[PDB]
Amino acid sequence: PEFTKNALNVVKNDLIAKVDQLSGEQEVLRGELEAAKQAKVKLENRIKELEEELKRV
Amino acid sequence: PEFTKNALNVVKNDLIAKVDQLSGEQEVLRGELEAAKQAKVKLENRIKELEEELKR
């Protein structure tokens, strides 16, 4: 009864902590993913600039 | 002239190489995101089951 409730709360809170840890990892990864996406746009625009410059000899 | 063309291509090819590396990083990152998302879903279902058991 008291032991059971206690035990259930202990494991429940363990799992909640694991979820929060994953959420933290997610936020970091999403940040890296956004940074990569923006950096790629810049590079691709620069490649188009260089292709124009090559055309102009 | 030809020296100019070669020089610009060095820069162009380097940028292309960098784009490819970022494409690789994006794919790895997306794979890790999906794994995390799926892991979270499983944890949340386990938490829900425990919450329902606590109600009893």
Curated annotation (Swiss-Prot), chain B:
PTM info: Phosphorylation by ROCK1 is crucial for the recruitment of JNK.
Top-level lineage group: Eukaryota
Subcellular location: Cytoplasm; Golgi apparatus; Cytoplasmic vesicle; Cell projection, Growth cone
Region (Leucine zipper-like domain (LZ)): 4-29
Function: The JNK-interacting protein (JIP) group of scaffold proteins selectively mediates JNK signaling by aggregating specific components of the MAPK cascade to form a functional JNK signaling module. May function as a regulator of vesicle transport, through interactions with the JNK-signaling components and motor proteins. Promotes neuronal axon elongation in a kinesin- and JNK-dependent manner. Activates cofilin at axon tips via local activation of JNK, thereby regulating filopodial dynamics and enhancing axon elongation.
Subunit structure: Forms homo- or heterooligomeric complexes. The central region of MAPK8IP3 interacts with the C-terminal of MAPK8IP2 but not MAPK8IP1. Binds specific components of the JNK signaling pathway namely MAPK8/JNK1, MAPK9/JNK2 and MAPK10/JNK3 to the N-terminal region, MAP2K4/MKK4 and MAP2K7/MKK7 to the central region and MAP3K11 to the C-terminal region. Binds the TPR motif-containing C-terminal of kinesin light chain, KLC1. Pre-assembled MAPK8IP1 scaffolding complexes are then transported as a cargo of kinesin, to the required subcellular location.
Protein family according to the UniProt entry: Belongs to the JIP scaffold family.
Disease: Neurodevelopmental disorder with or without variable brain abnormalities: A disorder characterized by global developmental delay, impaired intellectual development, delayed walking, poor or absent speech, and variable brain anomalies including perisylvian polymicrogyria, cerebral or cerebellar atrophy, and hypoplasia of the corpus callosum.
Official protein name in the record: C-Jun-amino-terminal kinase-interacting protein 3
The organism's taxonomic lineage, starting at the top: Eukaryota, Metazoa, Chordata, Craniata, Vertebrata
Residues of the full protein shown: 433 to 485 of 1336
